[PDB]
Each structure stands twice: as structure tokens, then as C-alpha cells.
Amino acid sequence: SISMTTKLSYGFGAFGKDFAIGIVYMYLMYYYTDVVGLSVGLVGTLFLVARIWDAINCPIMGWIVNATRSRWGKFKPWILIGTLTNSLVLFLLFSAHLFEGTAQVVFVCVTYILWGMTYTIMDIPFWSLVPTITLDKREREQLVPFPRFFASLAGFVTAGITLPFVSYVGGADRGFGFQMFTLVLIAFFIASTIVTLRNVHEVYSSDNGVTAGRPHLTLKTIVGLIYKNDQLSCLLGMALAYNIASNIINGFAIYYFTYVIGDADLFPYYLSYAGAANLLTLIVFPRLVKMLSRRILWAGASVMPVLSCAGLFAMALADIHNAALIVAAGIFLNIGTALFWVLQVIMVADTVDYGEFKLNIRCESIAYSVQTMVVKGGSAFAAFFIALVLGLIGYTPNVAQSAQTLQGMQFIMIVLPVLFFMMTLVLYFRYYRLNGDMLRKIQIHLLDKYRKT
């Protein structure tokens, strides 16, 4: 079985990894607009351009991680480099409050794109370690929940106690408190990286003496492996659909809590119940996956946010506000995302295994590069589709609009995510085959194929 030590160390590693980025994802816009003073248009354009650049750079980082030969392994050195460089670039990122003028703009842009690229460096190989630790069904099912739960935790802990820290430490100079809390984040991140590097011991590694991995590969060969691996491409499409849907829903929630009718002090209860739901569904996943199926749990992951969408649709039609429905939709969305993330990690592992099975090539870095680039392109395409819908309905001026036009915009924003969820779940049910007997077949085939000359 998997060493409990390795389980908890991977959990702590994921905790640090996601704790280093929660502050960014959650308050970088607030810092750049409320502490630095940059035009919202500039911030948004930078965010979108940088996410596009990261999605493009992802396969490049995968090719880098696959062709690297080193003592600690082919994932551990890039993990260490990424963690260190990302900590440094994060401190620089939130030290932007010092400069002014064109110098400040250049500093902000450079630091932001550097932070993104560094986090890619770190992220791809970290999750690429999963298929190395184990290539068994239930072992993966009861391993992944640890890092997923710890990442979700880190995020909610940020959401909860990031602002009190900044207020307590130089509450007047908000930039100072931000860059100070950055130190806490960096300490946790480096401690987690060290813990995971020492304790997590990769098995069945690609560069291992006998695992059917070719270190010398081209960018064309590797990237085309994604379509050659029909299951990996199916996973790509499913994750892209799910990510577009979840990003649209999360933007809707951010808009309904940040600007409109979010001043009832309702957000604390919503976030608390959301985190409770996510953490509880992650904790009991090892038992849910067995009580129910894997296919059933994926259907649920895509359907629970659909039920939340239906609920908030009934809301937007009947009552503009109702706290109970709001927290219920939050709980549904959070359970769905938890199930989705756990299954998605386990499934990219299954896909690297099926790639070794069919194509006779073991490449984890590429599958998890697909994971990361899809995570980015999801936000990118959500923004694209939202802008498309807005320009279509006539919101291109954004100066004055009919109330009925706003209600229609609301309804379309509620209905598009369910379209994407239907896409992801039907694609899964019609083209995905790595389950049950197929997984065991691939497992036995690989166990047998591991034979030196």
C-alpha cells in the first residue's frame, strides 16, 4: 500500500503549493486596483493575456520536464526550482506598491507573467508525481483526496485569514502588509516543498531503468501524443468544458457578491458552508468511490453544479435574493468541484498509464501539462464566451442597458454553464473507457511489461 507518510507529505506539499497562489487568485485584482491604482481594463487585459501565455507555455514545460535528466529525478529538481523562483517572483509581485508611473506598470506586468510561468514550472511536475507513486485503482482513489483536500483547505484558510493579517501588520500601508504575509506564504510553501521532496518517493518513474519512457523526444512528437492518446484528448475536452462552466459560474458569483446585493453580510456564511461541503466531500471520497461508482461520481460532479444553476435560475426568475438558495447552490458547486478535481487527477494518471499501454510511451509530464493548460484555457475561453455573448446581446458599450436586457444576460450566463456541463458529461459517457476492467487490464499489462531486457 501507499506509505501513510507519503500520503500526508504529498498532502502538505499540495497545501503549500496552493497556499502560495490562493492570495494571488483571490486578491491580486484587489491589490492592483485598491493599493496600486491601475485601470481595471489594464488589469483584465493583463490577466487574460497572461493566462493565454501560460496555456501556451504549458506544453513547453511538459517537454522540458520529460527531457530532463537529473539525480533527484526528472520531476523533483523542476519542482524545487519552480517553488523557489515562484516564491521570489511572488514577493516581487506584491512589492509593486513601491514604484510609480511607467516603471510601476512595467514592474507589475513583468512580475505577473513571471509568477505565472514559475507556478507552471512548479505545478506540472508536482502533479506528474502521482502516476509514479502508484498505478492501482483504489490506491489512487485514497491517495488523491489528501492533496486535493489540503489544496482546498489552503485556499479557504487564505480566504479566511488573509485580510486580518494585512490589517494587523501596517494596516495603513496595505502593500506592506501584503508583502509581509507573502513571507508567511513563502515559508509554508518552501517547508511543504522540502517535506514532499524528501518523503514522496517516486515509483514506476519514466526515467526508471524499465518503464518504457523515451527521454529524447521532440516537441512535435510529445504534443501530438495528446491526440494520439485518444483518452488524454477526451480528458482534455472534458476538463476544458467543465472549467469553462465553473469559471462562468464563479464569475457570476463574484459579480453577485462583490458589486450587487452582496452587502447583507451573507458571504461569510456562504464561504463557510462551501468550504465545509468541499472538505467533507473530499474526506469521504475514498468511501463514496466504492459505495457508488467512478462513473456515477463523475456524473454527480457535473450534475451538482447544474442543480445549483437551476436553483439560482429559479431564484433570478422569482426572487432576486434568497440566502438559503445561495448557500445551497454554493454547497452544490463545491461538492461538484471536489469530485471533479479528485477524479480528474486520478484520470490523468489513468491516461498516462493508458498511453504507456497503447502507444508504448510513458509520459506523465505531458498529461499534467494538459491538465494545467486546460485549467488556464478554461478561464480564457470563459472570458471569450462571455465577451461573445455580451457583444451579441448588445453590451458592447457598457454605458446604459435595458433592465430586460440585463435579465436576459443573467439568464444566458446561467444557461451557458449547464451547456458546458452537459458537454463534459456526455463526452465522458460516450468516449471515455478507462474504467473497471480496462483499468485492471492496463495495470496487469504494465506490471508485466516492467521486465529488464
Side-chain angles (χ1 to χ4, degrees), residues 220-382:
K220 163 58 187 173
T221 313
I222 187 161
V223 297
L225 194 147
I226 296 165
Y227 172 49
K228 294 158 64 58
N229 184 332
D230 56 293
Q231 295 294 302
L232 180 57
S233 70
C234 198
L235 181 141
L236 193 148
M238 286 155 48
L240 188 80
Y242 199 96
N243 276 296
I244 295 160
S246 183
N247 267 262
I248 294 162
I249 287 160
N250 201 46
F252 190 97
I254 282 157
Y255 153 76
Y256 262 86
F257 270 115
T258 293
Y259 302 89
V260 189
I261 199 142
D263 290 345
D265 193 53
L266 174 59
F267 184 81
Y269 288 19
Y270 170 95
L271 185 80
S272 304
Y273 277 31
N278 189 279
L279 269 38
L280 271 38
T281 186
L282 285 170
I283 277 158
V284 315
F285 180 90
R287 306 171 231 176
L288 260 283
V289 77
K290 193 180 180 68
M291 270 174 58
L292 281 52
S293 167
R294 263 199 198 181
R295 299 238 288 175
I296 292 303
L297 275 192
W298 181 272
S302 288
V303 161
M304 298 276 283
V306 160
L307 293 161
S308 85
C309 271
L312 55 93
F313 189 89
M315 214 195 70
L317 267 79
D319 202 325
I320 191 62
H321 183 271
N322 169 36
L325 198 148
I326 295 303
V327 301
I331 289 150
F332 276 59
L333 172 78
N334 279 250
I335 290 155
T337 55
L339 270 52
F340 161 84
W341 255 107
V342 165
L343 295 171
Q344 183 211 49
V345 178
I346 291 156
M347 281 153 76
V348 287
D350 301 342
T351 53
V352 302
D353 275 6
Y354 165 81
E356 201 190 338
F357 169 84
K358 165 178 162 184
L359 303 173
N360 201 352
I361 292 284
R362 192 175 183 73
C363 198
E364 317 96 322
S365 77
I366 197 185
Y368 288 88
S369 287
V370 155
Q371 191 190 263
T372 311
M373 97 162 176
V374 159
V375 163
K376 300 280 183 171
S379 181
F381 270 94

Side-chain angles (χ1 to χ4, degrees), residues 58 61-62 65 120-128 365 368-369 372:
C58 269
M61 189 49 201
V65 171
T120 290
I121 307 322
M122 192 272 165
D123 180 290
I124 280 160
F126 174 81
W127 292 117
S128 307
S365 77
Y368 288 88
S369 287
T372 311

Side-chain angles (χ1 to χ4, degrees), residues 380-398:
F381 270 94
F384 163 85
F385 280 116
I386 289 161
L388 193 78
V389 162
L390 259 54
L392 288 166
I393 206 185
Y395 198 82
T396 187
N398 191 353

Side-chain angles (χ1 to χ4, degrees), residues 111-296:
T111 49
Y112 186 55
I113 63 102
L114 287 165
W115 167 87
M117 276 183 284
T118 51
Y119 176 68
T120 290
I121 307 322
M122 192 272 165
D123 180 290
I124 280 160
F126 174 81
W127 292 117
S128 307
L129 286 170
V130 161
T132 80
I133 294 150
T134 305
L135 71 187
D136 177 28
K137 187 152 198 296
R138 191 155 73 174
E139 284 189 67
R140 281 173 177 178
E141 293 167 0
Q142 67 204 3
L143 168 58
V144 168
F146 283 84
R148 285 314 320 163
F149 159 96
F150 273 103
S152 297
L153 185 135
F156 285 113
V157 191
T158 283
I161 48 63
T162 182
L163 287 166
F165 192 110
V166 178
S167 82
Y168 185 89
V169 177
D173 191 0
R174 276 196 301 290
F176 169 75
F178 267 117
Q179 64 179 351
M180 273 293 282
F181 191 54
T182 287
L183 300 178
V184 169
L185 305 187
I186 291 166
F188 267 110
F189 189 18
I190 289 170
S192 89
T193 297
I194 291 161
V195 161
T196 182
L197 277 173
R198 184 180 175 274
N199 291 27
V200 173
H201 298 125
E202 58 221 288
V203 193
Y204 322 109
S205 177
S206 180
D207 64 4
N208 178 31
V210 59
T211 53
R214 285 234 310 281
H216 308 80
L217 283 166
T218 82
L219 182 64
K220 163 58 187 173
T221 313
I222 187 161
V223 297
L225 194 147
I226 296 165
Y227 172 49
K228 294 158 64 58
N229 184 332
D230 56 293
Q231 295 294 302
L232 180 57
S233 70
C234 198
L235 181 141
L236 193 148
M238 286 155 48
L240 188 80
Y242 199 96
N243 276 296
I244 295 160
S246 183
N247 267 262
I248 294 162
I249 287 160
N250 201 46
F252 190 97
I254 282 157
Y255 153 76
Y256 262 86
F257 270 115
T258 293
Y259 302 89
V260 189
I261 199 142
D263 290 345
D265 193 53
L266 174 59
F267 184 81
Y269 288 19
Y270 170 95
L271 185 80
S272 304
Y273 277 31
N278 189 279
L279 269 38
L280 271 38
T281 186
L282 285 170
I283 277 158
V284 315
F285 180 90
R287 306 171 231 176
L288 260 283
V289 77
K290 193 180 180 68
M291 270 174 58
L292 281 52
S293 167
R294 263 199 198 181
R295 299 238 288 175
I296 292 303

